[PDB]
Design a protein around this nucleic acid. Structure first.
Ligand code: K
Ligand code: MG
Ligand code: MG
Ligand code: MG
Ligand code: MG
Ligand code: MG
Ligand code: MG
Ligand code: MG
Ligand code: MG
Ligand code: MG
Ligand code: MG
Ligand code: MG
Ligand code: MG
Ligand code: MG
Ligand code: MG
Ligand code: MG
Ligand code: MG
Ligand code: MG
Ligand code: MG
Ligand code: MG
Ligand code: MG
Ligand code: MG
Ligand code: MG
Ligand code: MG
Ligand code: MG
Ligand code: MG
Ligand code: MG
Ligand code: MG
Ligand code: MG
Ligand code: MG
Ligand code: MG
Ligand code: MG
Ligand code: MG
Ligand code: MG
Ligand code: MG
Ligand code: MG
Ligand code: MG
Ligand code: MG
Ligand code: MG
Ligand code: MG
Ligand code: MG
Ligand code: MG
Ligand code: MG
Ligand code: MG
Ligand code: MG
Ligand code: MG
Ligand code: MG
Ligand code: MG
Ligand code: MG
Ligand code: MG
Ligand code: MG
Ligand code: MG
Ligand code: MG
Ligand code: MG
Ligand code: MG
Ligand code: MG
Ligand code: MG
Ligand code: MG
Ligand code: MG
Ligand code: MG
Ligand code: MG
Ligand code: MG
Ligand code: MG
Ligand code: MG
Ligand code: MG
Ligand code: MG
Ligand code: MG
Ligand code: MG
Ligand code: MG
Ligand code: MG
Ligand code: MG
Ligand code: MG
Ligand code: MG
Ligand code: MG
Ligand code: MG
Ligand code: MG
Ligand code: MG
Ligand code: MG
Ligand code: MG
Ligand code: MG
Ligand code: MG
Ligand code: MG
Ligand code: MG
Ligand code: MG
Ligand code: MG
Ligand code: MG
Ligand code: MG
Ligand code: MG
Ligand code: MG
Ligand code: MG
Ligand code: MG
Ligand code: MG
Ligand code: MG
Ligand code: MG
Ligand code: MG
Ligand code: MG
Ligand code: MG
Ligand code: MG
Ligand code: MG
Ligand code: MG
Ligand code: MG
Ligand code: MG
Ligand code: MG
Ligand code: MG
Ligand code: MG
Ligand code: MG
Ligand code: MG
Ligand code: MG
Ligand code: MG
Ligand code: MG
Ligand code: MG
Ligand code: MG
Ligand code: MG
Ligand code: MG
Ligand code: MG
Ligand code: MG
Ligand code: MG
Ligand code: MG
Ligand code: MG
Ligand code: MG
Ligand code: MG
Ligand code: MG
Ligand code: MG
Ligand code: MG
Ligand code: MG
Ligand code: MG
Ligand code: MG
Ligand code: MG
Ligand code: MG
Ligand code: MG
Ligand code: MG
Ligand code: MG
Ligand code: MG
Ligand code: MG
Ligand code: MG
Ligand code: MG
Ligand code: MG
Ligand code: MG
Ligand code: MG
Ligand code: MG
Ligand code: MG
Ligand code: MG
Ligand code: MG
Ligand code: MG
Ligand code: MG
Ligand code: MG
Ligand code: MG
Ligand code: MG
Ligand code: MG
Ligand code: MG
Ligand code: MG
Ligand code: MG
Ligand code: MG
Ligand code: MG
Ligand code: MG
Ligand code: MG
Ligand code: MG
Ligand code: MG
Ligand code: MG
Ligand code: MG
Ligand code: MG
Ligand code: MG
Ligand code: MG
Ligand code: MG
Ligand code: MG
Ligand code: MG
Ligand code: MG
Ligand code: MG
Ligand code: MG
Ligand code: MG
Ligand code: MG
Ligand code: MG
Ligand code: MG
Ligand code: MG
Ligand code: MG
Ligand code: MG
Ligand code: MG
Ligand code: MG
Ligand code: MG
Ligand code: MG
Ligand code: MG
Ligand code: MG
Ligand code: MG
Ligand code: MG
Ligand code: MG
Ligand code: MG
Ligand code: MG
Ligand code: MG
Ligand code: MG
Ligand code: MG
Ligand code: MG
Ligand code: MG
Ligand code: MG
Ligand code: MG
Ligand code: MG
Ligand code: MG
Ligand code: MG
Ligand code: MG
Ligand code: MG
Ligand code: MG
Ligand code: MG
Ligand code: MG
Ligand code: MG
Ligand code: MG
Ligand code: MG
Ligand code: MG
Ligand code: MG
Ligand code: MG
Ligand code: MG
Ligand code: MG
Ligand code: MG
Ligand code: MG
Ligand code: MG
Ligand code: MG
Ligand code: MG
Ligand code: MG
Ligand code: MG
Ligand code: MG
Ligand code: MG
Ligand code: MG
Ligand code: MG
Ligand code: MG
Ligand code: MG
Ligand code: MG
Ligand code: MG
Ligand code: MG
Ligand code: MG
Ligand code: MG
Ligand code: MG
Ligand code: MG
Ligand code: MG
Ligand code: MG
Ligand code: MG
Ligand code: MG
Ligand code: MG
Ligand code: MG
Ligand code: MG
Ligand code: MG
Ligand code: MG
Ligand code: MG
Ligand code: MG
Ligand code: MG
Ligand code: MG
Ligand code: MG
Ligand code: MG
Ligand code: MG
Ligand code: MG
Ligand code: MG
Ligand code: MG
Ligand code: MG
Ligand code: MG
Ligand code: MG
Ligand code: MG
Ligand code: MG
Ligand code: MG
Ligand code: MG
Ligand code: MG
Ligand code: MG
Ligand code: MG
Ligand code: MG
Ligand code: MG
Lengths: 275, 7, 48
RNA sequence: UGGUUCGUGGAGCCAUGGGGGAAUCUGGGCGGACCACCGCCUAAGGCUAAGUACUCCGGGUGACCGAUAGCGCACCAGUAC
RNA sequence: GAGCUAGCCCUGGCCAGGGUGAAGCUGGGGUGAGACCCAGUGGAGGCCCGAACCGGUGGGGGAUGCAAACCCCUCGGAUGA
RNA sequence: GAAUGCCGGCAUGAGUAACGAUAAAGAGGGUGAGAAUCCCUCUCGCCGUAAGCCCAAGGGUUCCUACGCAAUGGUCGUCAGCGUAGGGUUAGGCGGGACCUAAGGUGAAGCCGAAAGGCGUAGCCGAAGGGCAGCCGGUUAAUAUUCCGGCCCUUCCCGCAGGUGCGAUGGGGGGACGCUCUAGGCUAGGGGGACCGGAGCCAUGGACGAGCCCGGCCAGAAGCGCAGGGUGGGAGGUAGGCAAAUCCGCCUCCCAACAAGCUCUGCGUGGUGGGGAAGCCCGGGUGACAACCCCCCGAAGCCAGGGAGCCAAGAAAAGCCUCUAAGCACAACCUGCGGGAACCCGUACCGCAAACCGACACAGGUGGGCGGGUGCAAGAGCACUCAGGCGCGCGGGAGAACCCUCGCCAAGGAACUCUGCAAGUUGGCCCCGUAACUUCGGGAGAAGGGGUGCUCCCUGGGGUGAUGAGCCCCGGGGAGCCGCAGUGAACAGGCUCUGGCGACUGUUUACCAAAAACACAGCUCUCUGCGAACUCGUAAGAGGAGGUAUAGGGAGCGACGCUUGCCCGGUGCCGGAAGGUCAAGGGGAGGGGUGCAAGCCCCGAACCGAAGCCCCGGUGAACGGCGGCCGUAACUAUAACGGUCCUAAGGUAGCGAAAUUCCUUGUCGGGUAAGUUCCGACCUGCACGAAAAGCGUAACGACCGGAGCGCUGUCUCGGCGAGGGACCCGGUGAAAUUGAACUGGCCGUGAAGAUGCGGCCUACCCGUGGCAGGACGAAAAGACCCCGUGGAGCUUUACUGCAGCC
RNA sequence: CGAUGUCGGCUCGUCGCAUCCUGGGGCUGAAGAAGGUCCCAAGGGUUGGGCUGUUCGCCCAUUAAAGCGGCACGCGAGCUG
RNA sequence: CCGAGGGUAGGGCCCGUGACUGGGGCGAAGUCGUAACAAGGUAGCUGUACCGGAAGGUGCGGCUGGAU
RNA sequence: CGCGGGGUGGAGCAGCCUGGUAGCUCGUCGGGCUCAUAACCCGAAGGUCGUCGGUUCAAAUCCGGCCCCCGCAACCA
């Protein structure tokens, strides 16, 4: 339920903000935060390696439990749902009957006060983590490990999910958020339900300053530059591309495929992405 | 000071 | 207006200092050359 | 591929990054593709004075300079600036 | 060589005073319930006027300058990219 | 003798320009060889959110005192930030270190690289961040939270006493956090007092007064009072906090809970210790046994780690508290008390500037705190002033042109000019009132108008106090008074209509462009399944991202509205196990060299043999492209219609003489007396057109165009006046330039524009103030143009390589 | 080409005469008045505005007339831009 | 004081007129095609939508005022 | 007298390069179908190739001059 504003400035005319209705706790768990070292897109050489980064709001990293096979069988109560600035999803604070506390990505529909549990025997309820083999075909799932014990890699952004399509040998077939059809090993853990905060994609930033808050510096077109800088640079007046449209580094950027040909994972990908 | 231009 | 020389004792010592010079192949050659030339000062003066 | 006078040349020799991979004198390498004959030499361990180069330093000597010259500096100069 | 300048990282600091009056909230009206309307409260905003501060629009002066970019008048921004 | 040669010396310009903010000076006294310039005194002017005061950088003796004046000081100099000498900086509590960590740097382990070296978890370093104990006054020529005085406090060591399971670099808690707004109570600071203390004063018409003038505080331990912050207590279970744990976490139960209790700050009080004005006399003395009290205003500061709201979701580590492990419980630690112990470095002075950065004692630049009073609605704005600080290190005259900065102007009012450039006008506050259009916010301060001072009288609410008075903050009504004029001075929008462009606030060519350019939310295409793609790197390793397709990269377009047509033949990219071509390699038909031979050596056909290319398809918000000639309607004209050639397909909607139109000032209409511009149309669009987007669009703009009103020295058309210069006298004294010069006009001549040649004319010698026609005047070895088998940046289906990718 | 600043305007003039006006004339298809044409004549005079950078030109309102040319397309060590 | 009216400025309604432009009506014998009336030679009509020289065509849904 | 392309039955286009040959669509004329017109069907006619000159045995064709019709260019200032 993205929130609108009345047009009392030119920017408020279009700005929309998330409604924050699912949030129940407005400060994070002190024992679960650590400093997030901002990079400005610079690598250990000090060189910019990702252009146009920097200057966004200060953030604390929240440690997320992307394993959950860590504590098989031990139930936990959902204590709160909190804002996380390091990711699009909301996150859920879990109180294990152990006394241990952890954050997970908050699936859609998860309710404060309910319980969750992980393991081969867990019920098929939103928020529960099982190996992929023990989850029924057709189940919508998120936070999927891509290799056993290596941590949840797939379907983590707000609103996303994968669907279990079928089984074959030691592997289950998943339809990923991109539409790709892929084999993921059956011992890979996954969590029942789709990620929440599915309205995320409808926020209208509304003004340039909003991108600055997120750490996004202004992106300048190659066509606005000079030939020293860019294939599209130069020309008297405005100028079309005048060559196949290219990146700053000269490689083509309209159609040219870029996945490595002889990559071993090709044996495990059934169908490339959709739409 | 811009030089005079006899162009 | 603001000119280019804006003195700073710590900046001076950490940039041109004896220990900055010694840490580096090129900086040692600087010291080696200024000794061969007989410089009274191998390194900039700064009060620290 | 490099080295050699040898820039692919009839291109051997010496060295070797890659592949394959022996033999112990009736063994092996060389004599400019290669073959025969005839010869030369003993690879894949190491050391070795002297004759040779240089001049921060000392001395000796100039059909060398003589303070705008001779070292950047005859003098408190790699200084002042 | 980033003690100038450009960008980023870490840690601090600064922005007189006045103005406009969003959402929400409360109450009243409204309806089957509503939407909604009215008033009060409220204090939002790359909102308004304007110093500091940051700029450098137009003109004039200066032109072996006070100055290798300055001065006067005027002008832009001033809770924000 | 020449090289715009090199080094040095010395000329010319020239007693010329200038002497560095137009805040400003005058006199008397003194000193001295010498005084506009040093010292003292009186008068005058300037700053006063500073041009005053206090920190931090940076500077490095410039500080204070005695003696000096060659040089430095834009003049002078007896003076000085100058020369010589002597003196001067005092800390357990201030700042930094023997404490902590941030980015970052370094780096046992480890990883990588021909060498040099590059990485790298821990750890170490690293501060203007965390943490940590001193306040007031006095004293020196010069230091002072440092010395002294008064009152306070911290750690370490040892001892005594009491208490306790003591004990850590390990576990845990805490430290610990944003932005805007903000409550209560205080302090800082300030205003008034008919009260308290004070040297005095009565002037010139009046006043001996509730007169004038001056001052009326600061620091303080425990205790207490006020205001706040922090904090649940007990018990049972326990598998989590990488050992242990009574701590912490989770669960349960009981009690306490707009409290309390405990604890910690701030403020007040407080033993006591200080301070203490005007004026007068000589920094000191006095005043003075100084008084030290009431009322009001009141923070952005304090209580604080306070409250609320919001989204962009807001450091770490140590100190500290708690838990326990080895251990040790003769120890050890906690509390109280006593005695002892407590190191290193800085401290002078300048510090918006003559001591820092700008070659200068340079109108520039330089971070933090304090920054008083009155009035103007407010304020750090503006005017004047306090404290304090200055008059800017050349002066004296004169009162030309001309220049700069400024004031006024008859009648006219944009006629000025590329242009209302510039300058007028308008100008704050209160009230009245306010259009098209609109995205319903706005447009809006639209426009346009009225009010504004002072006096008396009546009166409303808020704060303080008491519910009153007094104080204080906002008012309301009536009656009057004065001037040309009441935001009476200073600070403070000219307005409107209509087009182009860009939605908007932003950004830019430091130092000739601020814009229509860039960016921007937003739209689309495309790549990327995660050891992602992509980027930097030889690599290791990084960034991407401690992210995961609602995500990340690349590209174009650029809010929003209504839309974005046709062509896939060429190029690109995408798909296509067939076919064609295809390198090394495989294969070895068949030859060759040599040898007596066994053999050794060489060449070598078919055939098998990747990517790429060919070939077959797809694909436009991929690169791109979107026709010609001829004829035809019952007036004419023009062609809805037809014919034919060509193409991959022949430009759709919308727009159009345009930021695009050559012919062009197209034609018609509007506006004007008159309009190459402007606005509205038309369409034979040289040469618009749909994301290098097309057509519109409220609001926005120091953008560019056209018009009108207001008002003006812009102009007809100039005049007068002010000051700073120019000018004259005293002081100091440059510059570019310069073959030498005894350097006139005309008409000719000359390498074609003559002071210098010819002929003629004219002309006594030398300056001063002015003007710029000439000396093809100065400056800069033309930046345009060409030339050089000169250079550099940039491009590509130029050539040839290389990285990278297959 | 070791630099002769290049359009227009403004200011300031000065000159030529192939004369725009004013003065004097001859011829006229000159009745008068007003013209046409040519001759002599350079003394003086030759306006203000709208458009455009404009020179030029067109237009408005006047006038005795609204002349044409040279002076480095006169004049940037005089200004503008 | 009020006050005819005059002046300034800004709005509202109505009439007239305007380069150009939109469609409408009418007009003895113009050009193009043939959409409808017969199953009108694709049943017609219809609201909407998109397209096309033109009538019209096509999509979706509806009506019989459709035939055999 | 800057550069390029074009001129052939009535219209619009082949033929030129590579000399000996004029071709295609439409139009026109005669006939047929139909009550009639169009469509359709069957036949036919019409171009000495812009002009002049040359080369050749022979010129639409190859070469040169002229005429006409389009199209492009015109920069440094
Ligand atoms: K040029
Ligand atoms: Mg909105
Ligand atoms: Mg709205
Ligand atoms: Mg939520
Ligand atoms: Mg922590
Ligand atoms: Mg690093
Ligand atoms: Mg990048
Ligand atoms: Mg970046
Ligand atoms: Mg994310
Ligand atoms: Mg979130
Ligand atoms: Mg797997
Ligand atoms: Mg979006
Ligand atoms: Mg952010
Ligand atoms: Mg973006
Ligand atoms: Mg961009
Ligand atoms: Mg560009
Ligand atoms: Mg550019
Ligand atoms: Mg570059
Ligand atoms: Mg390039
Ligand atoms: Mg380009
Ligand atoms: Mg360009
Ligand atoms: Mg262009
Ligand atoms: Mg460009
Ligand atoms: Mg364009
Ligand atoms: Mg394009
Ligand atoms: Mg192109
Ligand atoms: Mg390309
Ligand atoms: Mg995998
Ligand atoms: Mg895929
Ligand atoms: Mg600067
Ligand atoms: Mg600055
Ligand atoms: Mg600096
Ligand atoms: Mg320093
Ligand atoms: Mg420092
Ligand atoms: Mg530094
Ligand atoms: Mg360094
Ligand atoms: Mg150093
Ligand atoms: Mg080395
Ligand atoms: Mg020495
Ligand atoms: Mg050095
Ligand atoms: Mg060699
Ligand atoms: Mg060889
Ligand atoms: Mg080898
Ligand atoms: Mg042998
Ligand atoms: Mg052998
Ligand atoms: Mg050998
Ligand atoms: Mg041999
Ligand atoms: Mg031998
Ligand atoms: Mg041997
Ligand atoms: Mg020997
Ligand atoms: Mg000799
Ligand atoms: Mg000699
Ligand atoms: Mg000498
Ligand atoms: Mg000599
Ligand atoms: Mg020597
Ligand atoms: Mg020398
Ligand atoms: Mg010497
Ligand atoms: Mg010396
Ligand atoms: Mg810097
Ligand atoms: Mg720095
Ligand atoms: Mg501000
Ligand atoms: Mg209100
Ligand atoms: Mg509401
Ligand atoms: Mg509320
Ligand atoms: Mg603002
Ligand atoms: Mg305002
Ligand atoms: Mg101006
Ligand atoms: Mg200058
Ligand atoms: Mg200035
Ligand atoms: Mg000003
Ligand atoms: Mg403000
Ligand atoms: Mg403002
Ligand atoms: Mg903010
Ligand atoms: Mg000579
Ligand atoms: Mg010279
Ligand atoms: Mg020379
Ligand atoms: Mg010289
Ligand atoms: Mg000398
Ligand atoms: Mg000299
Ligand atoms: Mg000299
Ligand atoms: Mg002389
Ligand atoms: Mg002289
Ligand atoms: Mg002179
Ligand atoms: Mg001068
Ligand atoms: Mg001067
Ligand atoms: Mg001044
Ligand atoms: Mg005096
Ligand atoms: Mg004196
Ligand atoms: Mg004197
Ligand atoms: Mg004095
Ligand atoms: Mg006096
Ligand atoms: Mg110094
Ligand atoms: Mg002296
Ligand atoms: Mg002396
Ligand atoms: Mg001097
Ligand atoms: Mg000076
Ligand atoms: Mg003396
Ligand atoms: Mg001292
Ligand atoms: Mg002390
Ligand atoms: Mg110690
Ligand atoms: Mg390396
Ligand atoms: Mg360090
Ligand atoms: Mg510190
Ligand atoms: Mg301390
Ligand atoms: Mg104290
Ligand atoms: Mg003190
Ligand atoms: Mg916290
Ligand atoms: Mg935190
Ligand atoms: Mg902090
Ligand atoms: Mg915020
Ligand atoms: Mg106090
Ligand atoms: Mg007050
Ligand atoms: Mg336990
Ligand atoms: Mg359990
Ligand atoms: Mg505190
Ligand atoms: Mg006293
Ligand atoms: Mg006494
Ligand atoms: Mg503040
Ligand atoms: Mg606080
Ligand atoms: Mg850390
Ligand atoms: Mg014991
Ligand atoms: Mg204890
Ligand atoms: Mg020590
Ligand atoms: Mg010390
Ligand atoms: Mg001190
Ligand atoms: Mg300043
Ligand atoms: Mg300051
Ligand atoms: Mg000073
Ligand atoms: Mg400098
Ligand atoms: Mg001075
Ligand atoms: Mg200064
Ligand atoms: Mg005061
Ligand atoms: Mg005010
Ligand atoms: Mg003065
Ligand atoms: Mg001053
Ligand atoms: Mg005079
Ligand atoms: Mg002035
Ligand atoms: Mg004046
Ligand atoms: Mg007057
Ligand atoms: Mg006047
Ligand atoms: Mg007027
Ligand atoms: Mg007027
Ligand atoms: Mg202009
Ligand atoms: Mg005013
Ligand atoms: Mg209007
Ligand atoms: Mg309105
Ligand atoms: Mg309007
Ligand atoms: Mg409008
Ligand atoms: Mg509205
Ligand atoms: Mg009144
Ligand atoms: Mg008065
Ligand atoms: Mg204003
Ligand atoms: Mg803009
Ligand atoms: Mg722009
Ligand atoms: Mg636009
Ligand atoms: Mg727009
Ligand atoms: Mg702004
Ligand atoms: Mg610039
Ligand atoms: Mg520039
Ligand atoms: Mg520059
Ligand atoms: Mg420069
Ligand atoms: Mg400028
Ligand atoms: Mg520009
Ligand atoms: Mg601007
Ligand atoms: Mg730009
Ligand atoms: Mg924009
Ligand atoms: Mg290497
Ligand atoms: Mg990162
Ligand atoms: Mg990371
Ligand atoms: Mg858009
Ligand atoms: Mg843009
Ligand atoms: Mg935009
Ligand atoms: Mg609209
Ligand atoms: Mg195509
Ligand atoms: Mg195709
Ligand atoms: Mg294609
Ligand atoms: Mg192949
Ligand atoms: Mg093209
Ligand atoms: Mg094409
Ligand atoms: Mg079409
Ligand atoms: Mg269309
Ligand atoms: Mg047009
Ligand atoms: Mg026109
Ligand atoms: Mg247009
Ligand atoms: Mg055009
Ligand atoms: Mg035109
Ligand atoms: Mg034109
Ligand atoms: Mg016209
Ligand atoms: Mg008209
Ligand atoms: Mg036309
Ligand atoms: Mg608009
Ligand atoms: Mg608009
Ligand atoms: Mg703007
Ligand atoms: Mg602008
Ligand atoms: Mg106007
Ligand atoms: Mg004047
Ligand atoms: Mg004067
Ligand atoms: Mg005289
Ligand atoms: Mg003199
Ligand atoms: Mg002197
Ligand atoms: Mg001579
Ligand atoms: Mg002479
Ligand atoms: Mg002379
Ligand atoms: Mg003469
Ligand atoms: Mg000649
Ligand atoms: Mg001549
Ligand atoms: Mg002559
Ligand atoms: Mg002469
Ligand atoms: Mg001569
Ligand atoms: Mg002579
Ligand atoms: Mg002669
Ligand atoms: Mg002569
Ligand atoms: Mg003569
Ligand atoms: Mg004469
Ligand atoms: Mg003179
Ligand atoms: Mg004179
Ligand atoms: Mg003179
Ligand atoms: Mg002259
Ligand atoms: Mg001259
Ligand atoms: Mg010359
Ligand atoms: Mg000249
Ligand atoms: Mg120059
Ligand atoms: Mg040269
Ligand atoms: Mg030259
Ligand atoms: Mg030059
Ligand atoms: Mg040339
Ligand atoms: Mg060549
Ligand atoms: Mg040549
Ligand atoms: Mg060349
Ligand atoms: Mg080159
Ligand atoms: Mg690539
Ligand atoms: Mg020249
Ligand atoms: Mg010269
Ligand atoms: Mg020159
Ligand atoms: Mg004029
Ligand atoms: Mg005359
Ligand atoms: Mg004109
Ligand atoms: Mg001309
Ligand atoms: Mg013209
Ligand atoms: Mg007449
Ligand atoms: Mg003329
Ligand atoms: Mg001419
Ligand atoms: Mg000319
Ligand atoms: Mg001129
Ligand atoms: Mg000039
Ligand atoms: Mg000129
Ligand atoms: Mg000149
Ligand atoms: Mg001149
Ligand atoms: Mg001249
Ligand atoms: Mg009347
Ligand atoms: Mg039909
Ligand atoms: Mg029909
Ligand atoms: Mg039909
Ligand atoms: Mg039908
Ligand atoms: Mg159709
Ligand atoms: Mg010719
Ligand atoms: Mg042909
Ligand atoms: Mg033929
Ligand atoms: Mg034919
Ligand atoms: Mg023939
Ligand atoms: Mg050209």
């Amino acid at each position: 339920a993205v929130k609108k504003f009345k047009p009392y400035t030119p920017s408020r005319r279009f700005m929309t903000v998330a409604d924050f209705s699912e949030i129940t706790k407005t400060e994070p768990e002190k024992s679960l935060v650590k400093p997030l070292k901002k990079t400005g897109g610079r690598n250990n050489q000090g060189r910019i390696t990702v252009r146009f980064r920097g200057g966004g709001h200060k953030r604390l990293y929240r440690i997320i439990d992307f394993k959950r096979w860590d504590k098989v069988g031990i139930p936990a109560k959902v204590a709160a749902i909190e804002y996380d600035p390091n990711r699009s999803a909301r996150i859920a604070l879990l109180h294990y009957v152990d006394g241990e506390k952890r954050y997970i990505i908050a699936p859609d529909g998860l309710q404060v006060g309910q319980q969750v549990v992980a393991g081969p025997d867990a019920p098929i309820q939103v928020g529960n983590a099982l190996p992929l083999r023990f989850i029924p075909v057709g189940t919508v799932v998120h936070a999927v490990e891509l290799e056993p014990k290596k941590g949840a890699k797939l379907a983590r952004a707000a609103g996303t999910s994968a669907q279990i399509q079928g089984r074959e040998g030691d592997y289950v077939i998943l339809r990923l958020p991109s539409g790709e059809l892929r084999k993921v090993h059956g011992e890979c853990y996954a969590t029942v339900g789709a990620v929440g905060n599915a309205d995320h994609k409808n926020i209208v930033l509304g003004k340039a300053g909003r991108s600055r808050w997120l750490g996004r510096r202004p992106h300048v077109r190659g066509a606005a530059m000079n030939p020293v800088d860019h294939p599209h640079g130069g020309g008297e007046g405005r100028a079309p591309r005048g060559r196949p449209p290219a990146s700053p580094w000269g490689w083509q950027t309209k159609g040219l495929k870029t996945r490595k040909r002889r990559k071993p994972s090709s044996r495990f990908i059934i169908a490339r992405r959709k739409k | 000071m811009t030089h005079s231009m006899r162009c | 207006m603001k000119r280019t020389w804006q003195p700073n004792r710590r900046k001076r010592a950490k940039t041109h200092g004896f220990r900055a010079r010694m840490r580096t192949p090129g900086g040692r050659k600087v010291l080696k050359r200024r000794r061969q030339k007989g410089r009274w000062r191998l390194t900039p003066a700064v009060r620290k």
